[PDB]
Amino acid sequence: GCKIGPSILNSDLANLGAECLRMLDSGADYLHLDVMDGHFVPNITFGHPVVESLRKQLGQDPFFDMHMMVSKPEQWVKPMAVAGANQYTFHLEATENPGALIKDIRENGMKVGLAIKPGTSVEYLAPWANQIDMALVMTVEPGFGGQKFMEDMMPKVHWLRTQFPSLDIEVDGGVGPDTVHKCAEAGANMIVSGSAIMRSEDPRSVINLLRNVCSEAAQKR
Amino acid sequence: GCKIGPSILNSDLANLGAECLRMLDSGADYLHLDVMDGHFVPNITFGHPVVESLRKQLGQDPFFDMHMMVSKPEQWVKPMAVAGANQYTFHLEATENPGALIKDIRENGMKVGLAIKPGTSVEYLAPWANQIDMALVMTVEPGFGGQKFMEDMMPKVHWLRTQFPSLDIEVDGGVGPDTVHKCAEAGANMIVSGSAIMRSEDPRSVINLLRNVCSEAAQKRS
Ligand SMILES: [Fe+2]
Ligand SMILES: [Fe+2]
C-alpha cells in the first residue's frame, strides 16, 4: 500500500504535460500538484485552470493529489472537482471549520487530504483522522524552501501511524533517497518527492528506490 | 505603433510553452500573461514559477506583459523580474502607494503598466500617467471568465488618448475582431485578445486583422 507521488514545482512548468507524462511512464503512482495562492504561503504556483488542462491531456486514469496551500480552501473545492482532481488536500490551519469542509469535498466527489505545517501539533490533526482519506505531515515549511528535510517531524508520523494503523500518511518536503528511510521507518506510506525525482536522469530508478524503502518498512510493521 | 498581445488562459495550460511558441510564430507582438492570486480576483491562474519556465523556453526576445491581478503587487515585483518579465502591470486598486511601487518596478529593470477595473475612474490614472509605460483599461470585470465587452469603457480610452497622446493604451476583456474597432477608434493601440486568436486555425490571420483594424483606425484619426 505504498505509493510515490512526484511533485512538479521543480519541473519545466512551460511543458507540464510532458513532465507529468514521463513521471507516469516512470512508474509514479500519482501526481502531487502544489497549489499556492500567494496568501497562505508566499508563492503563487497555479490553480484549477492548469489542473483542467492537465487532466484533459493526461486523460481520466492518473490520480491527482491537490495540495491546496490556499487561504480559503472552501472556495476551490468545486473548481478543482470540475477540473478533474481526485483528492483535495487542504491545510488544517486554513479553515475554522474542517468538518464542514471535509463534508463539502466528499459531496463534490473527491477524496479528502488534511495537511499540517511543521509548527502545527499533530494533536490538532488526530481528532479529524477518522474523517479523512489521507494525512499529510509537512517536512518542510510550505512556500519557502528550498529547505532541509525536518527530521523532528518524524515523531508526528510515528504517532499517527501508532494511533491510526489503517490511515494513509503522506510526507512532503525534502524527501528523497537520503531521507525516505526516515519517513518509512516512522510510518509514512505515501511519499511526495520533487527535485530528487524530477532532476534525475533515471526517475524510474529513483521512484523504485523510494517505493522499495517504504514497502520494506511496511512489511516490518 | 499598434500591437497585438494574445492572452493565453484559454490555451492548453499544460503546454504553455508550445502555445506561446505558436503565438509568436503567428506574429504576436507580445504575450499578455494573466496572473491571478484568488484574492484580488476570484480565480487562480499561475505565478512567477510558470513565468520563469516560460522565459527559459521562449528565449530572451519575446515581450511579456504581466497582468498582475494580485492583492499585494509589491510582493511579486522581484520574483517577476528574476523570472524575466518585461513589464509589470499592476492594478491601481491593489495598492495604497502606487508611487513607491512604480519606482520599485523600474529599479528592478521592468517596464511599468497600470491597470484599472471597470468601476474605477480613469481620472485616477492621470497623476501617474507620466511615470508609467502603459495604461490598461479593463473592458470586462477581471476574474469572472467570459463576459461581454463593456462599450461604456470606451470613453476612458478616448479620454486617456486625448490627455496623453504618446501613452500606450491597452484594452483587455472581451476584445476580438467584433469589438477591436471600438477600442481602436477610441484610441487604444495595444490589444489583448484571447479565444478569438487561440481557437483559430490561422491565428496569424486573426492577429493581422486585429492589428490592421487598429492601425487603420489610428491612421484615420491622425
Ligand atoms: Fe506539496
Ligand atoms: Fe489580462
UniProtKB/Swiss-Prot annotation, chain A:
Output the Gene Ontology cellular-component terms. Answer: cytosol; extracellular exosome
Mutation effect (S7A): Nearly abolishes enzyme activity
Which InterPro entries does the entry mention? Answer: Aldolase_TIM, Ribul_P_3_epim, Ribul_P_3_epim-like, RibuloseP-bd_barrel
Keyword Hydrolase part of the UniProt annotation = no
Q: Name which cysteines form disulfide bonds.
A: none
Pathway of this protein?
Answer: Carbohydrate degradation
Cofactor(s) needed, names only, are: Fe(2+); Mn(2+); Zn(2+); Co(2+)
BP term (GO), one: pentose-phosphate shunt, non-oxidative branch
User: Which Pfam families does the record associate with it?
Assistant: Ribul_P_3_epim
Question: Which residues of this protein are catalytic?
Answer: D34 (proton acceptor), D172 (proton donor)
Q: Which positions bind a divalent metal cation?
A: H32, D34, H67, D172
Catalysed reactions, semicolon-separated? D-ribulose 5-phosphate = D-xylulose 5-phosphate
Gene Ontology molecular functions:
D-ribulose-phosphate 3-epimerase activity; identical protein binding; metal ion binding; protein homodimerization activity
Residues that coordinate or bind substrate: S7, H67, G143, F144, G145, G146, D172, G173, G174, G194, S195
* Cofactor details (free text): Binds 1 divalent metal cation per subunit. Active with Fe(2+), and probably also with Mn(2+), Zn(2+) and Co(2+).
According to the UniProt entry, what is the EC number of this protein? Answer: 5.1.3.1
Q: What is the effect of changing M69A?
A: Reduces enzyme activity by half
What happens upon changing D172A?
Alters protein structure
User: What's in the keyword line of the UniProt record?
Assistant: Acetylation, Carbohydrate metabolism, Cobalt, Iron, Isomerase, Manganese, Metal-binding, Zinc
Consequence the record notes for mutating H67A: Alters protein structure
> Is Zinc one of the keywords UniProt gives this record?
yes
Relate the assembly described in the record. Homodimer.
This molecule's function is given as: Catalyzes the reversible epimerization of D-ribulose 5-phosphate to D-xylulose 5-phosphate.
Tell me which family the UniProt entry assigns to this protein: Belongs to the ribulose-phosphate 3-epimerase family.
Q: What HAMAP family does the record tag this protein with? A: RPE
Q: What is the designated name of this protein? A: Ribulose-phosphate 3-epimerase
Specify the species: Homo sapiens
> Which gene specifies this protein's sequence?
RPE
